[PDB]
C-alpha cells in the first residue's frame, strides 16, 4: 500500500516541500500548525504530534518523505481495508443521509479551508452521483474515491 507513480511522487515532492517550511526533508508540528494557521485552523500540539507519529515509522518524530508516500498511498486507496473509503464518506456526510449532499460538502470545504464554489462541489457530487439522485451514496463514492 505504498505505491506511487513517478509523476505522483513528483507532486508529493512539491506538497511535502510546501508543508516542510524549513526545506530539510522532515515536517514538524510547528510547520503543520503554521500551514493550518494560514489555512484557518488551530489544532493542538497533541493532534499534530499524533498525526506525525502515526506515519512516523522510523521513530524520528517527524514526517519524512518515504513515510508521507506511505501515508498518502493509504489515504488515496487503502490502509488495508475499506476504512479510508468509509472515513472519507464519514467526513463528507456527517448527517447520515446515506448520500453525500453537495450543500454539506460545500460546508465541510469551508471548514477544511479548501473553499470551493457551489458549482465546484456540484460538479464533484454530480460525477460521483452515478444513479442521478443528486447525491452520491457509498457504493458510488467507493469507485470515485479511488479515482484520483
Amino acid at each position: 500500500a505504498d505505491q506511487l507513480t513517478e509523476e505522483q511522487i513528483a507532486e508529493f515532492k512539491e506538497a511535502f516541500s510546501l508543508f516542510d517550511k524549513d526545506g530539510d526533508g522532515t515536517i514538524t508540528t510547528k510547520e503543520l500548525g503554521t500551514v493550518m494557521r494560514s489555512l484557518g485552523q488551530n489544532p493542538t500540539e497533541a493532534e499534530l504530534q499524533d498525526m506525525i507519529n502515526e506515519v512516523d515509522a522510523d521513530g524520528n518524530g517527524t514526517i519524512d518523505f518515504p513515510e508521507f508516500l506511505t501515508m498518502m498511498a493509504r489515504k488515496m486507496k487503502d490502509t488495508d481495508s475499506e476504512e479510508e473509503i468509509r472515513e472519507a464518506f464519514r467526513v463528507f456526510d456527517k448527517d447520515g443521509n446515506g448520500y453525500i449532499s453537495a450543500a454539506e460538502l460545500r460546508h465541510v470545504m469551508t471548514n477544511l479551508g479548501e473553499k470551493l464554489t457551489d458549482e465546484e462541489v456540484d460538479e464533484m457530487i454530480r460525477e460521483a452521483d452515478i444513479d442521478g439522485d443528486g447525491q452520491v451514496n457509498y457504493e458510488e463514492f467507493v469507485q470515485m474515491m479511488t479515482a484520483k
Binding site: E84, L112, M144
Partner: peptide, 27 residues
C-alpha cells in the same frame, strides 16, 4: 499543487485528500 490540467481530477484528488482528517496533512 494546482488544478488546471483536468481540474476535476486534481481537485478531487487534493480537496478530498485534505478531507481525511480535521488537522489533515496532505503532505
Amino acid at each position: 499543487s494546482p488544478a488546471n490540467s483536468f481540474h476535476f481530477k486534481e481537485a478531487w484528488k487534493h480537496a478530498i485528500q485534505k478531507a481525511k482528517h480535521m488537522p489533515d496533512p496532505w503532505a
